[PDB]
Write a structure and sequence with these properties.
Alpha-Beta Plaits; four-stranded antiparallel sheet; Regulatory protein E2 (chains A, B); 2 helices; homodimer; papillomavirus transcription factor; dna-protein complex; transcription; dimeric beta-barrel; 23% helix
Protein backbone atom coordinates (compact mmCIF):
# COMPACT_ATOMS: atom_id res chain seq x y z
CA UNK A 1 0.00 0.00 0.00
CA UNK A 2 1.09 3.66 -0.28
CA UNK A 3 -0.26 6.72 1.56
CA UNK A 4 -0.65 9.95 -0.47
CA UNK A 5 -1.54 13.62 0.18
CA UNK A 6 -3.44 16.22 -1.90
CA UNK A 7 -2.49 19.93 -2.01
CA UNK A 8 -5.17 22.15 -3.64
CA UNK A 9 -4.91 25.95 -3.97
CA UNK A 10 -3.40 28.60 -6.30
CA UNK A 11 -0.94 27.16 -8.86
CA UNK A 12 1.19 30.33 -8.51
CA UNK A 13 1.90 29.57 -4.82
CA UNK A 14 2.17 25.79 -5.43
CA UNK A 15 4.88 26.33 -8.09
CA UNK A 16 6.92 28.46 -5.65
CA UNK A 17 6.48 25.88 -2.86
CA UNK A 18 7.73 23.03 -5.10
CA UNK A 19 10.99 24.94 -5.71
CA UNK A 20 11.58 25.17 -1.93
CA UNK A 21 10.95 21.40 -1.55
CA UNK A 22 13.66 20.61 -4.17
CA UNK A 23 16.34 20.63 -1.42
CA UNK A 24 14.19 18.14 0.56
CA UNK A 25 14.44 15.41 -2.11
CA UNK A 26 14.59 12.85 0.74
CA UNK A 27 11.16 13.89 2.12
CA UNK A 28 8.95 12.04 -0.43
CA UNK A 29 8.89 9.00 -2.77
CA UNK A 30 7.75 10.88 -5.91
CA UNK A 31 5.75 13.93 -7.10
CA UNK A 32 3.09 13.99 -9.86
CA UNK A 33 2.36 16.90 -12.25
CA UNK A 34 -0.32 19.56 -11.61
CA UNK A 35 -4.05 18.88 -12.18
CA UNK A 36 -7.33 20.63 -11.27
CA UNK A 37 -11.08 19.87 -11.04
CA UNK A 38 -13.12 20.24 -14.26
CA UNK A 39 -16.85 20.75 -14.95
CA UNK A 40 -18.09 23.61 -17.19
CA UNK A 41 -17.28 27.21 -18.26
CA UNK A 42 -13.67 25.98 -18.76
CA UNK A 43 -12.25 25.70 -15.20
CA UNK A 44 -8.43 25.38 -15.11
CA UNK A 45 -7.29 28.28 -12.85
CA UNK A 46 -6.97 26.01 -9.77
CA UNK A 47 -4.01 23.60 -9.46
CA UNK A 48 -3.35 20.49 -7.32
CA UNK A 49 -0.32 18.19 -6.81
CA UNK A 50 -0.38 14.47 -5.89
CA UNK A 51 2.34 13.38 -3.42
CA UNK A 52 3.18 9.77 -2.43
CA UNK A 53 5.15 8.50 0.60
CA UNK A 54 7.26 5.34 1.06
CA UNK A 55 5.83 4.78 4.58
CA UNK A 56 3.48 6.35 7.17
CA UNK A 57 6.64 7.59 8.96
CA UNK A 58 7.74 9.78 6.01
CA UNK A 59 4.22 11.25 5.67
CA UNK A 60 4.04 12.15 9.40
CA UNK A 61 7.41 13.98 9.23
CA UNK A 62 6.43 15.79 5.99
CA UNK A 63 3.37 17.09 7.88
CA UNK A 64 5.59 18.82 10.48
CA UNK A 65 8.55 19.43 8.11
CA UNK A 66 7.07 21.48 5.23
CA UNK A 67 5.23 24.79 5.83
CA UNK A 68 1.94 25.47 3.98
CA UNK A 69 0.21 28.84 3.59
CA UNK A 70 -3.53 29.27 4.30
CA UNK A 71 -4.33 29.23 0.54
CA UNK A 72 -3.67 25.45 0.30
CA UNK A 73 -5.77 22.49 1.51
CA UNK A 74 -3.85 19.54 3.02
CA UNK A 75 -5.48 16.08 2.85
CA UNK A 76 -4.01 12.67 3.82
CA UNK A 77 -5.16 9.05 3.31
CA UNK A 78 -4.07 5.51 2.34
CA UNK A 79 -4.70 3.66 -0.96
CA UNK A 80 -4.74 -0.13 -1.50
CA UNK A 81 -2.54 -1.14 -4.47
CA UNK B 1 -14.17 10.08 3.72
CA UNK B 2 -14.10 9.54 -0.08
CA UNK B 3 -12.71 6.60 -2.06
CA UNK B 4 -10.83 7.41 -5.30
CA UNK B 5 -9.29 5.49 -8.25
CA UNK B 6 -6.19 6.15 -10.40
CA UNK B 7 -6.03 5.40 -14.16
CA UNK B 8 -2.49 5.55 -15.61
CA UNK B 9 -1.61 4.79 -19.26
CA UNK B 10 -1.49 6.55 -22.66
CA UNK B 11 -3.22 9.97 -22.69
CA UNK B 12 -4.44 9.27 -26.26
CA UNK B 13 -6.53 6.29 -25.07
CA UNK B 14 -7.56 8.03 -21.81
CA UNK B 15 -8.96 11.02 -23.75
CA UNK B 16 -11.07 8.68 -25.92
CA UNK B 17 -12.30 6.76 -22.84
CA UNK B 18 -13.41 9.99 -21.09
CA UNK B 19 -15.65 10.84 -24.08
CA UNK B 20 -17.41 7.45 -23.74
CA UNK B 21 -17.96 8.05 -19.99
CA UNK B 22 -19.72 11.40 -20.70
CA UNK B 23 -23.07 9.56 -21.09
CA UNK B 24 -22.45 7.91 -17.68
CA UNK B 25 -22.48 11.24 -15.78
CA UNK B 26 -24.26 9.41 -12.91
CA UNK B 27 -21.35 6.95 -12.43
CA UNK B 28 -18.97 9.26 -10.48
CA UNK B 29 -18.91 12.29 -8.13
CA UNK B 30 -16.32 14.32 -10.10
CA UNK B 31 -13.32 14.00 -12.46
CA UNK B 32 -9.96 15.83 -12.15
CA UNK B 33 -7.73 16.97 -15.05
CA UNK B 34 -4.83 14.90 -16.46
CA UNK B 35 -1.44 14.65 -14.68
CA UNK B 36 1.67 12.44 -14.99
CA UNK B 37 4.78 11.48 -12.97
CA UNK B 38 7.81 13.80 -13.25
CA UNK B 39 11.56 13.31 -12.60
CA UNK B 40 14.18 14.20 -15.24
CA UNK B 41 14.75 14.34 -19.04
CA UNK B 42 11.33 16.10 -19.24
CA UNK B 43 8.77 13.28 -18.76
CA UNK B 44 5.21 14.29 -19.75
CA UNK B 45 4.17 11.65 -22.35
CA UNK B 46 2.24 9.58 -19.76
CA UNK B 47 -1.18 10.77 -18.49
CA UNK B 48 -3.31 9.89 -15.43
CA UNK B 49 -6.82 10.89 -14.25
CA UNK B 50 -8.05 11.13 -10.62
CA UNK B 51 -11.63 9.89 -10.06
CA UNK B 52 -13.67 10.27 -6.83
CA UNK B 53 -16.81 8.36 -5.73
CA UNK B 54 -19.70 9.42 -3.45
CA UNK B 55 -19.75 5.98 -1.76
CA UNK B 56 -18.10 2.53 -1.88
CA UNK B 57 -21.24 1.34 -3.74
CA UNK B 58 -20.65 3.69 -6.72
CA UNK B 59 -16.97 2.65 -6.94
CA UNK B 60 -17.85 -1.09 -6.97
CA UNK B 61 -20.35 -0.59 -9.82
CA UNK B 62 -17.90 1.60 -11.79
CA UNK B 63 -15.43 -1.33 -11.58
CA UNK B 64 -17.88 -3.64 -13.40
CA UNK B 65 -19.58 -0.87 -15.45
CA UNK B 66 -16.72 0.78 -17.40
CA UNK B 67 -14.40 -1.23 -19.69
CA UNK B 68 -10.63 -0.58 -19.56
CA UNK B 69 -8.05 -1.67 -22.15
CA UNK B 70 -4.80 -3.42 -21.13
CA UNK B 71 -2.82 -0.16 -21.58
CA UNK B 72 -4.32 1.34 -18.37
CA UNK B 73 -3.60 0.55 -14.69
CA UNK B 74 -6.62 0.54 -12.34
CA UNK B 75 -6.00 1.30 -8.63
CA UNK B 76 -8.54 1.79 -5.81
CA UNK B 77 -8.27 3.03 -2.19
CA UNK B 78 -9.85 5.25 0.50
CA UNK B 79 -8.64 8.66 1.77
CA UNK B 80 -9.41 10.26 5.16
CA UNK B 81 -10.65 13.86 4.73
Amino acid sequence: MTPIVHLKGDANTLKCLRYRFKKHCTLYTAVSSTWHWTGHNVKHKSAIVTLTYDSEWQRDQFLSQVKIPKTITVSTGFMSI
